[PDB]
DNA sequence: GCCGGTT
DNA sequence: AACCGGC
DNA sequence: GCCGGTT
DNA sequence: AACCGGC
């Protein structure tokens, strides 16, 4: 990670930080503001990075050619926008924040990519693990890493900002940081109903995986396929059986 | 619908207004059907305020006088229990309905969907196909076939400089649509997805029929998704394990 | 504690 | 509660 | 037109 | 992008 060396800083700055009454999505901006101040040459919003990539290559027009600028099938897959959106891009028609985008922030350096999400949590409310990332997208990601042998190109990490309502604004009370690729893949909770999302709180994320990036991919694909099989038959029991009587 | 007879009115007041764009409608409905119109959370408060005698969740759950409505409108046991005149419910993202209209102990559940017609059409989550399944099951077990409708109002808008402007609307009734026509997007939180404007309204049977017909559709689509899971999520990745 | 459905 | 983009 | 994954 | 409640 690029932000880990200064995490203790981020942690200490964000704590006690307040914002005017995700619900706490103004806390993301602080993290981005901070990143952009201490690692400014590394820090991008995902759309910002796409904009920079294309601005550096004005000659390169069309989606075909523009996709080539990625030098990576897995990154092309995680990062790019659609073909018409890419074809249509211009200095006048730049990319903007996109609901669906994979990552909140990109830390890039020497061709190594850290995709960073900021999750925000209302510590008052009962714990409810948030959607992290699509288990399916993650399966595809794992398959593309293996097919193209990209096991040393990018990490997917998380920064959780705990907050509470203090009078008339939100205040951050603590944070956590975890690395997707350091967890035991077979331990990832896939919530099929919840748009097929891996779900957890960062603070709970296991961080003891031992093998290589390749082994993680293989093991996650095993876990995915197993959970998918289980869910298939588990659907008959929960969504069919209970209703058969009425028909 | 209580809304339908005055749809022209609504349409006419909304078209051209300026400001996802959370668009009133509530305002209009309130100022024209005051004693019929409620946010969901507000209707809950109303119900409990009107019965200070009752306390505890079990007792206040009886105030609904309907297993189905209880299923659709009520908060959890604890939050009900802890409800107080000095501790009211607030808007909850999770609530079934945007607006509830009730007259003569009949309920119209109204969602207001918004839509940027500048962008390319993408059917929105409407309601959980699994929630709807439980709903029809409850309607049948409890013979509540004349109690509530679930209806939708689509506000089409478009960005003009600084201000976002409504430029058309649609209204449909869920229980007038061909149940087997309803698109159940499993991956999308098991949601029914449609735009209102596109919603079949040619159903002619009874409420009971609709419910039984829907459950048949649901059970069928659940099996199909179960099976489809193998091809979509299993075979494509086996070559790696 | 464990678990998964909904906006 | 929306939201894009493959073919 | 058709269809369905993601934040 | 997060959000409750059943036992
Ligand atoms: Mn993101
Ligand atoms: Mn975020
Ligand atoms: Mn609603
Ligand atoms: Mn709405």
Coordinates of C-alpha atoms (C1' of nucleotides) and ligand atoms in Angstrom, one line a residue:
Chain A
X1 CA 0.0 0.0 0.0
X2 CA 1.0 3.6 -0.6
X3 CA -1.1 5.1 2.1
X4 CA -0.2 2.6 4.8
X5 CA 3.2 4.2 5.6
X6 CA 1.3 7.3 6.6
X7 CA -1.9 5.6 7.9
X8 CA -1.1 6.6 11.5
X9 CA -1.1 10.2 10.2
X10 CA -4.4 9.8 8.4
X11 CA -5.8 8.1 11.4
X12 CA -4.7 10.9 13.7
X13 CA -5.9 13.7 11.4
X14 CA -9.3 12.3 10.7
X15 CA -10.1 11.5 14.3
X16 CA -12.0 14.4 15.9
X17 CA -12.5 15.9 12.4
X18 CA -16.1 17.2 12.0
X19 CA -18.3 17.8 9.0
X20 CA -21.7 19.5 8.6
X21 CA -24.7 17.2 9.3
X22 CA -23.3 7.2 2.2
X23 CA -24.4 9.4 5.1
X24 CA -20.9 10.5 5.9
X25 CA -19.6 10.8 2.4
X26 CA -18.1 14.2 3.1
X27 CA -15.5 12.2 5.1
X28 CA -14.3 10.7 1.8
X29 CA -13.4 14.2 0.6
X30 CA -11.2 14.8 3.6
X31 CA -9.3 11.5 2.9
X32 CA -8.9 12.6 -0.7
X33 CA -7.9 16.1 0.4
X34 CA -5.3 14.6 2.7
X35 CA -4.0 12.0 0.2
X36 CA -3.8 14.8 -2.4
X37 CA -1.7 16.8 0.1
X38 CA 0.8 14.2 1.2
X39 CA 1.0 12.0 -1.9
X40 CA -0.3 14.5 -4.4
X41 CA 1.6 12.9 -7.4
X42 CA 0.1 9.5 -6.6
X43 CA -3.5 10.4 -5.8
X44 CA -6.4 10.4 -8.3
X45 CA -10.1 9.9 -8.3
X46 CA -10.7 7.1 -10.8
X47 CA -12.4 9.4 -13.4
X48 CA -9.5 11.9 -12.8
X49 CA -7.0 9.2 -13.7
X50 CA -8.9 8.3 -16.9
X51 CA -9.0 12.0 -17.8
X52 CA -5.3 12.3 -17.2
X53 CA -4.5 9.2 -19.2
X54 CA -6.4 10.5 -22.2
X55 CA -5.2 14.1 -22.0
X56 CA -1.7 12.8 -22.2
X57 CA -2.6 11.1 -25.5
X58 CA -4.7 13.5 -27.6
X59 CA -3.6 11.8 -30.8
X60 CA -5.2 8.6 -29.6
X61 CA -8.9 8.8 -30.5
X62 CA -11.6 6.1 -30.5
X63 CA -12.4 3.5 -27.8
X64 CA -10.3 0.7 -29.4
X65 CA -7.1 2.8 -29.3
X66 CA -7.9 4.4 -26.0
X67 CA -8.4 1.0 -24.3
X68 CA -4.9 0.1 -25.5
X69 CA -3.4 2.8 -23.3
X70 CA -4.1 0.5 -20.3
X71 CA -1.3 -2.0 -20.9
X72 CA -3.4 -4.4 -18.8
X73 CA -6.5 -6.4 -19.4
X74 CA -7.3 -6.6 -15.7
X75 CA -7.0 -2.8 -15.2
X76 CA -8.8 -2.2 -18.4
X77 CA -11.6 -4.2 -16.9
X78 CA -11.6 -2.6 -13.4
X79 CA -11.0 1.0 -14.5
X80 CA -12.3 1.9 -17.9
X81 CA -15.7 3.3 -18.9
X82 CA -17.8 1.9 -21.7
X83 CA -16.9 2.1 -25.4
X84 CA -19.2 5.0 -26.4
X85 CA -18.2 6.9 -23.2
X86 CA -14.6 6.4 -24.2
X87 CA -15.1 7.1 -27.9
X88 CA -16.9 10.3 -26.9
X89 CA -14.5 11.6 -24.4
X90 CA -12.8 14.9 -25.1
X91 CA -11.0 17.8 -23.4
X92 CA -14.4 19.5 -23.4
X93 CA -16.4 16.3 -22.5
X94 CA -14.4 14.9 -19.6
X95 CA -15.3 12.0 -17.3
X96 CA -16.9 12.8 -14.0
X97 CA -17.7 10.8 -10.9
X98 CA -19.6 7.7 -11.8
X99 CA -21.9 5.8 -9.4
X100 CA -20.7 2.4 -10.6
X101 CA -17.0 3.1 -10.5
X102 CA -14.8 0.4 -8.9
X103 CA -12.7 2.6 -6.7
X104 CA -13.0 5.9 -4.7
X105 CA -9.3 6.8 -5.0
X106 CA -6.4 5.5 -7.0
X107 CA -2.9 5.6 -5.6
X108 CA -0.5 5.0 -8.5
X109 CA 3.3 4.9 -8.6
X110 CA 5.8 3.2 -10.8
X111 CA 3.0 1.3 -12.6
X112 CA 1.7 -0.2 -9.3
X113 CA -1.9 0.4 -8.6
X114 CA -3.7 0.7 -5.2
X115 CA -7.4 0.9 -5.6
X116 CA -8.7 2.5 -2.4
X117 CA -12.2 2.6 -1.1
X118 CA -13.4 4.8 1.7
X119 CA -16.2 3.1 3.6
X120 CA -18.0 5.2 6.2
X121 CA -19.8 3.9 9.3
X122 CA -22.3 5.3 11.7
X123 CA -21.0 3.7 14.9
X124 CA -24.3 4.6 16.7
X125 CA -26.4 2.2 14.5
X126 CA -26.3 -1.6 14.9
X127 CA -23.4 -3.2 13.0
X128 CA -24.4 -4.0 9.4
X129 CA -21.6 -5.1 7.2
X130 CA -21.6 -3.0 3.9
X131 CA -21.3 -4.2 0.4
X132 CA -17.5 -4.1 -0.4
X133 CA -17.3 -5.3 -4.0
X134 CA -19.2 -7.7 -6.2
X135 CA -18.1 -11.3 -5.6
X136 CA -18.7 -11.8 -9.4
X137 CA -16.5 -8.8 -10.5
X138 CA -14.0 -10.2 -8.1
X139 CA -14.2 -13.6 -9.7
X140 CA -13.7 -12.1 -13.2
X141 CA -10.8 -10.1 -11.7
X142 CA -9.2 -13.2 -10.4
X143 CA -9.6 -15.0 -13.7
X144 CA -8.0 -12.1 -15.6
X145 CA -5.1 -11.9 -13.3
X146 CA -4.4 -15.6 -13.9
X147 CA -4.9 -15.5 -17.7
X148 CA -2.6 -12.6 -18.0
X149 CA -0.3 -13.4 -15.1
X150 CA -0.7 -10.0 -13.5
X151 CA -0.1 -10.9 -9.8
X152 CA 2.1 -7.9 -9.0
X153 CA 0.2 -5.0 -10.5
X154 CA -2.4 -3.8 -8.1
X155 CA -3.9 -4.1 -4.7
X156 CA -7.5 -3.5 -3.5
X157 CA -7.6 -1.9 -0.1
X158 CA -10.1 -0.3 2.3
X159 CA -10.2 2.6 4.7
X160 CA -13.2 2.7 7.1
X161 CA -14.1 6.0 8.7
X162 CA -16.2 5.5 11.9
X163 CA -18.3 8.5 12.8
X164 CA -21.2 9.7 15.0
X165 CA -23.7 12.5 15.2
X166 CA -22.5 15.1 17.7
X167 CA -25.1 17.8 18.0
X168 CA -25.4 19.3 14.5
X169 CA -22.5 17.7 12.7
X170 CA -20.8 14.3 12.1
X171 CA -17.5 13.6 13.8
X172 CA -15.0 10.9 13.1
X173 CA -14.2 8.7 16.2
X174 CA -11.8 6.1 14.7
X175 CA -10.7 4.3 11.5
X176 CA -9.5 1.0 10.1
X177 CA -7.4 -0.1 7.2
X178 CA -7.4 -3.6 5.6
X179 CA -6.0 -5.1 2.4
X180 CA -8.4 -7.3 0.4
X181 CA -5.6 -9.5 -0.8
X182 CA -4.3 -10.2 2.7
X183 CA -7.5 -11.9 3.8
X184 CA -8.3 -15.6 3.7
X185 CA -10.4 -15.8 0.5
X186 CA -12.5 -18.7 1.8
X187 CA -13.5 -16.4 4.7
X188 CA -15.1 -13.7 2.5
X189 CA -18.8 -13.5 3.1
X190 CA -20.7 -13.5 -0.2
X191 CA -24.2 -12.1 0.2
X192 CA -25.9 -13.3 -3.0
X193 CA -29.1 -11.3 -2.4
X194 CA -27.1 -8.1 -1.7
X195 CA -26.2 -7.7 -5.4
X196 CA -23.8 -10.6 -5.0
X197 CA -21.5 -8.5 -2.8
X198 CA -18.7 -9.5 -0.5
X199 CA -19.6 -7.8 2.8
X200 CA -17.6 -6.9 5.9
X201 CA -16.4 -4.1 8.1
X202 CA -12.8 -3.3 7.5
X203 CA -12.0 -3.7 11.2
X204 CA -13.1 -7.4 11.0
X205 CA -11.2 -8.2 7.8
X206 CA -8.8 -11.1 8.4
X207 CA -5.2 -10.2 7.4
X208 CA -3.2 -13.4 7.5
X209 CA -3.2 -14.9 4.1
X210 CA 0.1 -16.6 3.4
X211 CA 0.5 -17.7 -0.1
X212 CA 1.2 -15.7 -3.3
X213 CA -1.2 -13.3 -5.2
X214 CA -1.7 -16.2 -7.6
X215 CA -2.7 -18.6 -4.9
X216 CA -5.2 -16.0 -3.5
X217 CA -6.8 -15.8 -6.9
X218 CA -7.1 -19.6 -7.3
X219 CA -8.4 -20.0 -3.7
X220 CA -11.0 -17.2 -4.1
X221 CA -12.2 -18.7 -7.4
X222 CA -12.6 -22.0 -5.5
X223 CA -14.6 -20.3 -2.8
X224 CA -16.7 -18.4 -5.3
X225 CA -17.7 -21.5 -7.3
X226 CA -18.5 -23.3 -4.1
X227 CA -20.6 -20.6 -2.7
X228 CA -22.3 -20.3 -6.1
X229 CA -23.3 -24.0 -6.1
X230 CA -24.5 -23.8 -2.5
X231 CA -26.6 -20.7 -3.3
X232 CA -28.2 -22.4 -6.3
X233 CA -29.8 -25.3 -4.3
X234 CA -30.3 -22.9 -1.4
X235 CA -32.6 -20.9 -3.6
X236 CA -35.0 -23.9 -4.2
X237 CA -35.4 -24.2 -0.5
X238 CA -35.9 -20.5 0.3
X239 CA -37.6 -19.1 -2.7
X240 CA -39.5 -22.0 -4.2
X241 CA -40.5 -24.5 -1.5
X242 CA -42.1 -21.9 0.9
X243 CA -44.4 -20.8 -1.9
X244 CA -45.3 -23.9 -3.8
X245 CA -48.4 -24.5 -1.7
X246 CA -50.2 -21.4 -2.9
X247 CA -50.1 -22.7 -6.5
Chain B
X1 CA -56.2 4.6 -6.7
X2 CA -57.0 7.9 -4.9
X3 CA -54.3 9.4 -6.9
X4 CA -55.5 8.3 -10.4
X5 CA -58.7 10.4 -10.6
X6 CA -56.5 13.5 -10.1
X7 CA -53.5 12.4 -12.2
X8 CA -54.1 15.2 -14.7
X9 CA -53.9 17.7 -11.9
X10 CA -50.6 16.3 -10.6
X11 CA -49.1 16.1 -14.1
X12 CA -50.1 19.7 -14.8
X13 CA -48.5 21.1 -11.7
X14 CA -45.3 19.0 -12.0
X15 CA -44.5 19.6 -15.7
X16 CA -42.1 22.5 -16.0
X17 CA -41.1 22.7 -12.3
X18 CA -37.4 23.2 -11.7
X19 CA -34.7 22.6 -9.0
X20 CA -31.2 11.8 -8.4
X21 CA -33.5 14.8 -7.8
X22 CA -35.8 14.1 -4.8
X23 CA -38.9 15.8 -6.2
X24 CA -41.8 16.8 -4.0
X25 CA -45.2 15.5 -5.2
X26 CA -45.8 14.9 -1.5
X27 CA -46.4 18.7 -1.3
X28 CA -49.1 18.6 -3.9
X29 CA -50.8 15.5 -2.6
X30 CA -50.7 16.9 1.0
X31 CA -52.2 20.3 0.0
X32 CA -55.0 18.5 -1.9
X33 CA -55.6 15.3 0.0
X34 CA -54.5 16.5 3.5
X35 CA -56.3 13.9 5.5
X36 CA -55.3 11.1 3.2
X37 CA -51.6 11.7 2.6
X38 CA -48.5 10.5 4.6
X39 CA -44.9 9.7 4.5
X40 CA -44.7 6.1 5.7
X41 CA -42.9 7.0 8.9
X42 CA -45.4 9.8 9.5
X43 CA -48.3 7.5 9.1
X44 CA -46.7 5.3 11.8
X45 CA -46.3 8.2 14.2
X46 CA -49.9 9.2 13.5
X47 CA -51.2 5.7 14.2
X48 CA -49.4 5.5 17.5
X49 CA -50.2 9.0 18.7
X50 CA -53.9 8.2 18.1
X51 CA -53.6 5.4 20.6
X52 CA -51.5 6.5 23.6
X53 CA -53.3 3.8 25.6
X54 CA -51.3 1.1 23.8
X55 CA -47.6 0.4 24.6
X56 CA -45.1 -2.3 23.7
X57 CA -44.6 -3.5 20.2
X58 CA -47.0 -6.5 20.4
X59 CA -49.9 -4.3 21.3
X60 CA -49.1 -1.5 18.8
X61 CA -48.7 -4.2 16.1
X62 CA -52.4 -5.1 16.7
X63 CA -53.3 -1.5 15.8
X64 CA -52.5 -2.4 12.1
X65 CA -55.4 -4.9 12.0
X66 CA -53.7 -6.7 9.2
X67 CA -50.9 -9.3 8.9
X68 CA -50.1 -8.0 5.4
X69 CA -50.0 -4.3 6.3
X70 CA -48.1 -5.2 9.4
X71 CA -45.6 -6.9 7.1
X72 CA -45.5 -3.9 4.7
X73 CA -45.6 -0.8 6.9
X74 CA -44.3 -1.7 10.4
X75 CA -40.9 -1.1 12.0
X76 CA -39.1 -3.8 14.0
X77 CA -40.2 -4.9 17.4
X78 CA -37.6 -2.8 19.4
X79 CA -38.1 0.4 17.5
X80 CA -41.9 0.0 17.9
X81 CA -41.5 -0.8 21.6
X82 CA -39.3 2.3 22.1
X83 CA -41.6 4.6 20.1
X84 CA -42.7 7.5 22.2
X85 CA -44.5 10.8 21.6
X86 CA -41.1 12.3 22.5
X87 CA -39.3 9.6 20.4
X88 CA -40.9 9.6 16.9
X89 CA -40.0 7.6 13.8
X90 CA -38.1 9.4 11.1
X91 CA -37.6 8.8 7.4
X92 CA -35.9 5.4 6.8
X93 CA -34.3 4.6 3.5
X94 CA -35.4 1.1 4.0
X95 CA -39.1 1.9 4.2
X96 CA -41.4 0.2 1.7
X97 CA -43.2 3.3 0.5
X98 CA -42.5 7.0 -0.3
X99 CA -46.1 8.1 0.3
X100 CA -49.1 6.4 1.7
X101 CA -52.7 7.5 1.0
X102 CA -55.4 6.0 3.2
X103 CA -59.1 6.6 3.0
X104 CA -62.0 4.5 4.5
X105 CA -59.4 2.0 5.8
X106 CA -58.0 1.4 2.3
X107 CA -54.3 1.9 1.6
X108 CA -52.6 3.2 -1.5
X109 CA -48.8 2.7 -1.3
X110 CA -47.2 5.2 -3.6
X111 CA -43.6 5.2 -4.7
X112 CA -42.3 8.2 -6.7
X113 CA -39.6 7.1 -9.1
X114 CA -37.4 9.8 -10.7
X115 CA -35.7 9.6 -14.0
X116 CA -33.0 11.4 -15.9
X117 CA -34.3 11.1 -19.5
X118 CA -31.1 12.6 -20.8
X119 CA -29.3 9.4 -20.0
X120 CA -29.8 5.9 -21.4
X121 CA -32.8 4.0 -20.0
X122 CA -32.1 1.7 -17.1
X123 CA -35.0 0.1 -15.3
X124 CA -34.9 1.0 -11.6
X125 CA -35.3 -1.3 -8.6
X126 CA -39.1 -1.1 -7.9
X127 CA -39.8 -3.6 -5.1
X128 CA -38.2 -6.8 -3.9
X129 CA -39.6 -9.8 -5.8
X130 CA -39.1 -11.7 -2.6
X131 CA -41.0 -9.1 -0.5
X132 CA -43.8 -9.2 -3.1
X133 CA -43.9 -12.9 -2.8
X134 CA -44.3 -12.8 0.9
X135 CA -47.0 -10.1 0.4
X136 CA -49.1 -12.2 -1.9
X137 CA -48.7 -15.2 0.4
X138 CA -50.0 -13.1 3.2
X139 CA -52.9 -11.7 1.1
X140 CA -54.0 -15.3 0.5
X141 CA -53.6 -16.8 4.0
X142 CA -55.4 -13.8 5.4
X143 CA -57.8 -13.2 2.6
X144 CA -56.8 -9.5 2.3
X145 CA -57.8 -9.1 -1.3
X146 CA -59.5 -5.7 -0.9
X147 CA -57.1 -3.7 1.4
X148 CA -54.3 -2.0 -0.4
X149 CA -52.8 -1.2 -3.8
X150 CA -49.1 -0.6 -4.7
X151 CA -48.8 2.2 -7.3
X152 CA -46.0 4.2 -9.0
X153 CA -45.5 7.7 -10.2
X154 CA -42.6 8.4 -12.5
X155 CA -41.2 11.9 -12.7
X156 CA -39.1 12.5 -15.8
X157 CA -36.6 15.3 -15.6
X158 CA -33.7 16.9 -17.5
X159 CA -30.9 19.2 -16.6
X160 CA -31.0 22.8 -18.0
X161 CA -28.0 24.8 -16.9
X162 CA -28.3 25.2 -13.1
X163 CA -31.8 23.9 -12.7
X164 CA -33.3 20.4 -13.1
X165 CA -36.7 20.4 -14.9
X166 CA -39.5 17.9 -14.9
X167 CA -40.8 17.3 -18.4
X168 CA -43.3 14.5 -18.0
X169 CA -44.8 11.9 -15.7
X170 CA -46.4 8.4 -15.7
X171 CA -48.6 6.6 -13.2
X172 CA -49.2 2.8 -13.0
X173 CA -50.8 0.3 -10.7
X174 CA -48.7 -2.7 -9.8
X175 CA -51.8 -5.0 -9.4
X176 CA -53.0 -4.1 -12.9
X177 CA -50.0 -5.5 -14.6
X178 CA -49.6 -9.0 -16.0
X179 CA -47.7 -10.6 -13.1
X180 CA -45.8 -13.0 -15.5
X181 CA -44.6 -9.8 -17.3
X182 CA -42.7 -8.5 -14.3
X183 CA -38.9 -8.6 -14.7
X184 CA -37.2 -10.1 -11.7
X185 CA -33.6 -9.0 -11.7
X186 CA -32.0 -11.4 -9.2
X187 CA -28.6 -9.9 -9.1
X188 CA -30.2 -6.4 -8.4
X189 CA -31.2 -7.3 -4.9
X190 CA -33.9 -9.6 -6.3
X191 CA -35.8 -6.5 -7.5
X192 CA -38.6 -6.2 -9.9
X193 CA -37.4 -3.6 -12.5
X194 CA -39.4 -1.5 -14.8
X195 CA -40.0 2.1 -15.8
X196 CA -43.6 3.0 -14.9
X197 CA -44.3 4.2 -18.5
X198 CA -43.5 0.7 -19.7
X199 CA -45.6 -1.2 -17.2
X200 CA -48.2 -3.6 -18.6
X201 CA -51.7 -2.6 -17.4
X202 CA -53.8 -5.2 -19.1
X203 CA -54.5 -7.6 -16.2
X204 CA -58.2 -8.3 -15.7
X205 CA -58.5 -11.0 -13.1
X206 CA -59.2 -10.6 -9.4
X207 CA -56.7 -9.6 -6.7
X208 CA -56.7 -13.2 -5.5
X209 CA -55.8 -14.3 -9.0
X210 CA -53.1 -11.7 -9.4
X211 CA -51.4 -13.0 -6.2
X212 CA -51.7 -16.6 -7.1
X213 CA -50.5 -15.8 -10.6
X214 CA -47.6 -13.8 -9.2
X215 CA -46.4 -16.6 -6.9
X216 CA -46.4 -18.9 -9.8
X217 CA -44.2 -16.5 -11.7
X218 CA -41.8 -16.0 -8.8
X219 CA -41.4 -19.7 -8.0
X220 CA -40.7 -20.2 -11.7
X221 CA -38.1 -17.4 -12.0
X222 CA -36.4 -18.7 -8.8
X223 CA -35.8 -22.1 -10.3
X224 CA -34.5 -20.6 -13.5
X225 CA -32.0 -18.4 -11.6
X226 CA -30.9 -21.4 -9.5
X227 CA -30.1 -23.3 -12.6
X228 CA -28.7 -20.3 -14.5
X229 CA -26.2 -19.8 -11.6
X230 CA -24.3 -22.9 -12.7
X231 CA -23.6 -21.6 -16.1
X232 CA -23.1 -18.0 -15.1
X233 CA -21.0 -18.5 -11.9
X234 CA -19.6 -22.0 -11.8
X235 CA -18.6 -23.5 -15.2
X236 CA -16.8 -20.3 -16.3
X237 CA -14.4 -20.6 -13.4
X238 CA -14.0 -24.3 -12.9
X239 CA -10.9 -24.3 -15.3
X240 CA -9.0 -22.6 -12.5
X241 CA -9.5 -25.0 -9.7
Chain C
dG1 C1' -23.7 -13.9 18.1
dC2 C1' -25.0 -15.1 13.7
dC3 C1' -27.2 -14.1 9.5
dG4 C1' -29.0 -12.1 5.0
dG5 C1' -32.7 -9.1 2.7
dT6 C1' -34.0 -3.8 0.9
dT7 C1' -33.9 0.9 -0.3
Chain D
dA1 C1' -32.8 3.8 -5.5
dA2 C1' -31.2 4.4 -9.2
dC3 C1' -27.6 3.6 -12.6
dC4 C1' -24.7 1.7 -18.5
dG5 C1' -23.4 -0.6 -21.7
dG6 C1' -22.7 -5.4 -24.1
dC7 C1' -24.1 -7.5 -28.6
Chain E
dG1 C1' -34.3 -4.1 -28.7
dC2 C1' -32.8 -7.1 -25.1
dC3 C1' -31.0 -8.0 -21.2
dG4 C1' -28.7 -7.7 -16.3
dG5 C1' -24.7 -6.4 -13.1
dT6 C1' -22.8 -2.3 -9.5
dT7 C1' -22.2 1.4 -6.4
Chain F
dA1 C1' -23.4 2.7 -0.7
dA2 C1' -24.7 1.5 3.0
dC3 C1' -28.6 0.0 6.0
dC4 C1' -31.9 -3.6 10.5
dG5 C1' -33.9 -7.0 12.9
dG6 C1' -35.2 -12.0 13.4
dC7 C1' -34.0 -15.6 17.2
Ligands
LIG1 MN1 -16.2 3.1 -5.0
LIG2 MN1 -17.0 5.2 -0.4
LIG3 MN1 -39.7 3.5 -0.9
LIG4 MN1 -38.7 7.7 -4.4

